[PDB]
Design a binder for this molecule. Structure first.
Ligand SMILES: CNC(=O)N1CCc2c(c(N3CCCc4cc(-c5cnn(C)c5)c(C(F)F)cc43)nn2C2CCOCC2)C1
Length: 127
């Protein structure tokens, strides 16, 4: 099997805006998670081809990763902060759906999600 194309990251047919919450999600949330010791499995789409996992995209039909989230934030793809937050949650849920609980990949996702929830609990009120 090939990999699927990555999720769409740009759409010139929908309106664009910048807000302080989206700025916070790119500059504080994404930046802090990206530099984490355990970020590297989530920084790009799961490469089922290189990792020889033929059933990954048979099980995971809504893939998401922090490289896509990065690109969507940079392209002003999100109108609402909640759209981005939902993408982060999809990434974590995909990991918990596919991977063995208590094993290395899941432990790494849990560490990132804890940090994610801490930063989101400090999401600034709309400017
Ligand atoms: C968020 N990532 C994610 O959800 N994933 C899906 C499942 C997965 C991944 C890896 N990773 C990730 C870490 C790097 C890695 C490296 C190799 C590898 C082996 N040799 N070389 C040169 C590299 C392999 C291997 F499967 F090919 C797998 C993986 N494992 N699993 C499964 C875990 C259950 O058990 C079977 C493998 C990603």
């Amino acid at each position: 099997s090939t990999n699927p194309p990555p999720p769409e990251t740009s759409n010139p047919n929908k309106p664009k805006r910048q807000t302080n919450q989206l700025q916070y999600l790119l500059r504080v949330v994404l930046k802090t998670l990206w530099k984490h010791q355990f970020a590297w499995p989530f920084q790009q789409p799961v490469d089922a081809v290189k990792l020889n996992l033929p059933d990954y995209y048979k099980i995971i039909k809504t893939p998401m990763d922090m490289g896509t989230i990065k690109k969507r934030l940079e392209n002003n793809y999100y109108w609402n902060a909640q759209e981005c937050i939902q993408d982060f949650n999809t990434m974590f849920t995909n990991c918990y759906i596919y991977n063995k609980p208590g094993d290395d990949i899941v432990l790494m996702a849990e560490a990132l999600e804890k940090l994610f929830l801490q930063k989101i609990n400090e999401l600034p009120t709309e400017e």
